[model samples]
Target: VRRYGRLTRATGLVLEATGLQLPLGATCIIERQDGPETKEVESEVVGFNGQRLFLMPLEEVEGILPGARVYARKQLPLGPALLGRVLDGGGKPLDGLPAPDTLETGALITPPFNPLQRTPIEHVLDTGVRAINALLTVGRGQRMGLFAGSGVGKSVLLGMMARYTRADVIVVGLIGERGREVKDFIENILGPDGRARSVVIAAPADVSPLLRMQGAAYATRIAEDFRDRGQHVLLIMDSLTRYAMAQREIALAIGEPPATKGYPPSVFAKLPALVERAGNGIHGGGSITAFYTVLTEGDDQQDPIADSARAILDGHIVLSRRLAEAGHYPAIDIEASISRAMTALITEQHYARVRLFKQLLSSFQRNRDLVSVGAYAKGSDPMLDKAITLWPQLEAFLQQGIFERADWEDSLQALDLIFPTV
Candidate 1:
């Protein structure tokens, strides 16, 4: 059944309509007349207040006015055909191709949680970067975070993963990034073969907040569908902080009170809900190993979004501008990174070596300033001396070229070589 409403109020990209009782997240179309040139704007229901429906326009709201008609409609469609195509936030084609004409059509529902049937993540998901594959190894169905500030090579790292991850299908969501960056990523970074097996959904910074939020939700549903088909899927959301920011925009527009640093309470709940969508499915139905990027302004790890992501994800790979400035590729701060899922997969010998490596790296990080200032004592401690001596080799091992592909065996061999007797 179709429901219609009259636009009663317009407030900063939020349109308050009545006479339509649609659920939150339902798609809508607003019809407004411009000198007999009927212009339609796409929108979605975001909030409701006692007989009033709040809508945010997916497109620009330049000519919309009060008394505009709002028509609630079905959500975007999805299918296997979406693979190898570039789509907008609303699943519309952007790669100069026709829209996907698949059977499935609807917004993503919450992932079913079955504690008894949930499978443990044991297999490795090799992300060809040597530093990540070895030191911060991720599990097949784990959700990991790539936490870094701007100019720390977040794009470079994510591009490498899109090209080299072993997942059967890849769904990438480019949410609230620059338009130029989105075009550069799709056109120049990912290889042709990788692009063939991937589906990219982007909502650039210039787009509406509703569209940016839709990009993330659409990408999640695509990944979920692929995982249900028994394929190991990799879902990469570049800077989920923007997704939260998009929600924040709508919340504030609708007069919702701010909680932390002007972010609404709903944002905190939404982050975990979106994250829990990808994991090891029941009965070996396939898995979605996700890596979401969280941008930290001024390198603050305590940013609300960063803190929440670190707590929920199975592990996190922290990229340091300090290492990047020192000409390190990948620039992963080993001391700051952790892999919780690897504890179950790693053998005792491997665990011991990892522990020793962490200890040495921690010591070197503390003494970096001392060594650089030429005020450090020689051979003060044997372990510190060893760390100083091995620092160069460790740096080299961690520095994987953009095009480098480090397999499981190669990463293990290199790790073993680094700590020969551990």
Candidate 2:
């Protein structure tokens, strides 16, 4: 009997003479019980400190002991109907209360849409944050990054996004977050009248690093399942930086060379794989939208976490402590935050709102400039003065129902009144 492939199992088989170990980097074929057999696979012996052999993707080797097995390995493909109506981490149905009917099991793991047929994200995804909705609009198939200093309401913003988006499913992955934070999140978003049935996978701060890494993978798998089921899925990963740290810890345990800042050399490779999985497909009407958070130490945006996040996300939302202290809810400094693809996906009305926002931003900047030069006293310009008078009203509009209240109907009505002239 001969054994091949990275992972292999054979039924009613016994060990036999190993063959000329194929080139350690050559690809081999493995027959499966169901679906097309996998081919050109390479094998790597992981878990062994530098003493183990690591094979390339197309590499193969000869001479392996075979053992008896009961079943052949099965390859599950991503397909539509993969994640329909499943309960999230808190065991709440993601769809409406009754739960949608399940799709054929065969379609579960297959990619729902063809890569070439996807439409560019052409519609806005509301987050109920005025600065975000009026400026950096999120679109389908877009992955946005959330960055902030610790204790600056990162989770609060994430919860708001989950509550407000038009997505059919929300999957939240809490990687190495504090247990208290998770508990608070559950109370705020999962208890009653929640707009989404979210799936949460959490790894406590003290858990094994490997468990944290696996938690992310598990949450991603769940998201893929949701996409396959013809539901637009929004996946929120609280912090990829923490996930990367977990990866580094796992790598160190196995004696891999530490890369920059104690990270593994493969950190760059692993991150993109996680983010790139989110997209619109051709086979079904579902998509995977991701919002990843990156925490900067001492509020340093130049850290490797921020660097990696910028490389993968379409845009970023930066939370501001200064604004927060001044009683600004959401606390996003619009001038410093951006959405790279907003021009392509936003509606004309949405764009108009953004333009109004820009005008306000310009006034704020000019006021700051004038004050810096001591050329102007406070409340000098009529437009600036009017804006200052209107600011509190706008903030009340933003807070009353946009974030604090859950009635989307009332919220839309309020927006209609506020922007009627525009």
Candidate 3:
């Protein structure tokens, strides 16, 4: 059905819907008539002024004399086969890769499902990283974020996860990351020495915030496609903090001033729209687990971006600069982080061991702190001495290279090397 709507102005950047009210976020096409020459265009409704709608063009529509007809539809792609290829936000082939044979659309909006529709999560994402496995288990269908300061291995960690995580399909979303790293990433991870199970979506730093958001969204949809086909999917959004920052950048660009710092008041709320895409047995079956990397401004997790990220995520792995400085790779601060869902899925025996280690690790930290002060002699507490003796061995167990991705049982056997049998 054709619904006729007239444009109020001729500016290429913006237009008004005069005859019909299209919902914001709805996609539309326009046809313009000026005497003999006619033009067809595309746009999306971005805002509303009570009775009027504001639209952003898909491309330039040069002639509009206040009565351009608009066609709206509620419908919602990858390069050729998504192998040996990369894309910008527009789905344009990056690095001169071949174009997709026939672009396919996927579900754009993923609302949360009711518990009754959910299947109990019995799956685990064993990335072979012992600390991650033991302390912050990534379960099927859970949303996990990596929080860290600049240069603290969030990107490196993401790559490690992609390489090591056990999933049928892996989708990496590089939203607003620097172009400098894109080539390097492809060469190392997706080109010469890459997993056949993985695909990536990259929209570099220079693109608009909307593009960054849309780019990640495209990757998420890809992940969901694999999931809907009954394969487990792992979606990695490296630098989710940038995604939020980009969201803020767009909010400010669009004149949404709900936050004092230019972000909309509801920026955090947008996370669920992304996170809800990830899970196990969603609506009864198929899983989409999500892993996100977030940057901490000034090393403060309470920075608006990090704070909001913490709230919406199922759990986080907080990497420490101090530990990195101490020469620890994957320098995660286990105690400071929390995993809300992993406990339910872990066996009691596994939980007990993890808990036991945490207790020992805490005691070890206390002993180290006391030794630093030196008011009391080091030999005073035998328990402290035991902790001092055990700490190095535990550290060695936790520090493994990315290539050393152990299976759940392999991780178990590797950990047993450090853990003494009673």
Candidate 4:
């Protein structure tokens, strides 16, 4: 008779006796009192060497002994409802919430939508930052690039956006970052009150370049899984430029022809494969909103990483070291950034608010111009003074507040309050 036991620690279960000698992956599954009573379930072997087996959903394994009996059942498929929640590295629930309500079991491997079917980006996704919202707006299904130097608040701003947005799932792709940084981000932004179930694919800075390359692919695959569930997923790649660098390193090690900037000719193809995955599906209600980061060498805007990413993204958010020095948390250089899809997603009311906001910004620019020309520049012109006075008010208005709690209902209500006259 076959005996079963609960796994006490995170360990691997290997299937050795099968005549085929298949190697299964490593995972730890614990039997839940509420889990399906049947011991047999279709599962895929993701990690295995010749001698050990690892399961896919590490949480599903109950118990194991050295000679325990094991059976490989068919793999059960996931459905559309998995899109909105957070997942761990192995695609298991990390949110601690109940299983999502809309699980579609059979359609796990459907192809993505044709690009032709996608609606042209016409609406703006307001980030509530005057500079970004009025100029470099985020658009649905649009991949926006955030380029910055080290110590800039790129990750912080991205975390804030992920927590504030209505996107069902936020997949954070952490490439080549320290594990401590990853832990800090989770504790600060993805804690219980945060987006608990958001997926994090973290490749530690010390990991092999091969693993770093795989991390991006893993992130994209998980985002695809979320998309398949007919849910809108926001995929935030902390730094794709690093991933590109990893790819280049691997290519050079293998003696491949160096493409532009020492990258492979296939870099472009690989990039599109990542960005093109975000879209609306015909059968499900889902989308993938990407906020990918890039690092500019020497703070140069025309750096290869920045240029390549900008070419494919719908918008660009450029961070300013000058502003950072001035003690701005986001330090966004509004004038230098722009969003191509700003006009598409916003309602006329929000658009008008944005217009008013830009008018204020333009006035501020004009004041700076007057100062540059030395035309009685030092607080002499009434318009210039007024503009300076209004700038902070506008900033306050734009940076009203970011929601620490994920309450969409309250958020929409707050939006109504902010745009009361509209």
Candidate 5:
């Protein structure tokens, strides 16, 4: 560990170090030799050329000349911090605060959690939205994607969960999101009105793609750190559409071969490693619930990035532009969204009721079609008119105010009142 590697090339943001043999994702230091007084920049080992190392700096490597010494060390685990502490992509304080010198760190690129080690995900993660709680729901250690188009309240829905979940920690990983939204949330939200336990990481749209990815990896490390502390944590990413696009940007810049949809061939391949970070940590009996959002064109649920994401995640929460334009908050399309954990963990009574609810929603959908085209004889059928009347009630039930997190008993009561006994 004392022996170091020599820096050979400094091009753009990457540092090329020779004479160092380190594994990919290994942590290394880029230290400026300032005559016994040295300054160090933290970096991670990325690519390799027969033992030659390519290091990705946690921050920009703008100044120091190329010849600075490179020390190859084992990966440093992200240190832990208190609630509400804002961190950068490298787990350093974004508020310009300092890290605790005795902070415990974990491996930066550890193996993905084994599926066999995981307990059955039967616990209901109350997302506060009664519509979601009653129908599609999340498991505590599950990976879920919120797929939506523009104006469909995707980000708002995500924010509601970040603000309302009954978790000890809420780790929000914000990368390549609109700066205005960030400003609005941070300023208007937070303090007495916002999440007291939320730890936000920033790599806003202005930052480079690599930094965005770094920011994501950084946030996951924090989630892992918190989970190790035996806390229930919700890790939400504003959009993986941006995360995928960022992957494309990095690949194009590096001349990595493009695959379908102009993204790197390994886009799906890289996702599993990142997403599988959610699990029950060994140090404690805690779990990380991952909820990643993805932006899509209204008609393109089959978009490669979105499709691939839906495939890897445990469930998908699809939003509807039509529902949004019709003034529906959350705008979730029950027909399109589904949970793999639905039947696996749902009790027989609950799952059976959910099926009946689906039937009612379908009947309402047919009546809706008839009305949309003036084909329905308004008062012809008693059952038809009755189902139609319930449509408005469904709307009223689904619409929710910000910061509304409905309890399980309340969720069950609301559903019971709205849906008839069948």
Candidate 6:
């Protein structure tokens, strides 16, 4: 016996269906009839209320109306062949090439489980950004956020990590990105060689909200599949803010009350679920080190979306607009950024250097106005003189060439120059 249901109502992106009891995330197809013409809409069971079920349409629901017939469908198949392929949020091929040819298949979603058997994150993940590697060090299996306002350097920094992070598999989710940038990312950032080792899932802004959220899930699922096979995977989802907005739209459509910043509680719960799925698996299984970008409004640190991500992630790297305005590439604010998993991954010496350099940087920031106006004379304060001397060197150390890729040792050497005695 196959599972099927009848549509009770259609409200925006959410469809109310009766006579079916499929589990959450189970795929279903709705057959709608308009006169003699018919259209089919693919959807997933998202929630339930007593005898009713809430469905999120994966495609346009323009022709879908009440009394449509819904039928359970097989979940999309994923496998090793998914590597080196380009796909949309729904696992459909986007590359001009044909679909992957393989008999293997895997789940589209892996539910989060208890991490009591999880391995400790001790290996450093070199991001190739000198500032990030030297200060906000990331560990294998760590979940981190890149927080920034629009027009800053989030994409460039993310591209550098995907290009040089040294992970076995790279999964990039371009959810809610513009259509043109998707092509640019695939061709320019991830050239042919890079695409050969990565999986790119794109659900651009023109797609439905359900599809945008689905793109995030599908990317995580692919990363999990590779992780289960004992491969170190780096998952980069650009702009979790848009993903949250997509979820918010769906939640509002389904009658969920807005809680924080017009986002329902479901949006908050759903984000951690997606992030927690990417860490180290039990008993030394492969790890998925995840970096999610969260776009802040007007660089507001108190943005609820950024706050929620910072709470759930292991750490965050904040990108400063002031630095970008001053022609600093990457524009990462080392003072505002931090990594909770760094202590166990770095040596005591490295830690000491970072602390000392940060103190100098803070001093420079405090006396920046005086230095700019040439009102502060040197020699009176040795500490201020030292700070002035090291400021340009620190900026030079943080600035990386477009094609540059620096490893852990090189990053440490650069930091050493800024804090020579420390």
Best by TM-score: 1
lDDT of each: 0.84, 0.60, 0.71, 0.59, 0.74, 0.83
For every model in order, what is the number of clashing pairs?
0, 27, 3, 30, 2, 0
How many backbone clashes are present in model 3?
3
- When summed lDDT is taken over every stretch of 10 residues in candidate 2, the lowest stretch is 68-77
**Model 1 per-residue lDDT tens digits across residues 1-422:** 56678888887667788888787787778987888789788888888777589888887788877788888664676778888999987788999988988787765564455645668898889887778877777889899998888888888888898888888899999999999998888878786877898999999988888888878988998888888788889999986899999889888887889999779999999899888887888745888999899988868866898888998999899899888898888888887888898878878787777787888888888777688877887868778988978888887888988888888778888889988764
**lDDT by residue (tens digit), candidate 3, 271-374:** 65676666665534468888887877657855777776788788989888888888888888888888888788787767776786787788878666656776
Candidates' TM-scores? 0.93, 0.70, 0.84, 0.67, 0.86, 0.92
TM-score, model 3 to reference: 0.84
Q: Which regions of candidate 6 are displaced past 4 Å?
A: 1-4, 8-13, 16-18, 32-39, 51-54, 62-66
Strongest candidate by lDDT = 1
Give candidate 2 regions above 4 Å deviation.
1-117, 365-389, 393-420
Q: Rank the candidates by TM-score, best first.
A: 1, 6, 5, 3, 2, 4
What digit string (tens of lDDT, one per residue) describes model 4 on residues 1-422? 33343222334332222322233322223233334443432233444445444333322345334333344321122444543454433344545766555443332223557877665554444443444554456766778888788776776777777666667777787887777887787677555544464666667677655556556766776677777667677788877887777667655643468767667875666676666666554433566778888886748755666777888887778887876776666677677777777766666766676665566577777666555765654556564565666676655543433453324333334444444363
* Distance from true location, Cα of 241 in model 3, Å: 2.1
Which tens-of-lDDT digit does each residue in 243-362 have in candidate 2?
Answer: 888777656644578777767786767787777777664434677778988886857756776888897789988888876676666777677778987878665765675666556556
Model 4: how far residue 248 lies from native, Å: 0.8
Ranking by lDDT: 1, 6, 5, 3, 2, 4
Q: What is the lDDT of residue 232 in candidate 6?
A: 91
Q: Give the range of the ten consecutive residues with the poorest summed lDDT in model 3.
A: 74-83
Cα miss at 418, model 1 (Å)? 2.3
In candidate 6, which residue pairs get closer than 3 Å at backbone N, Cα or C atoms, i.e. clash?
none
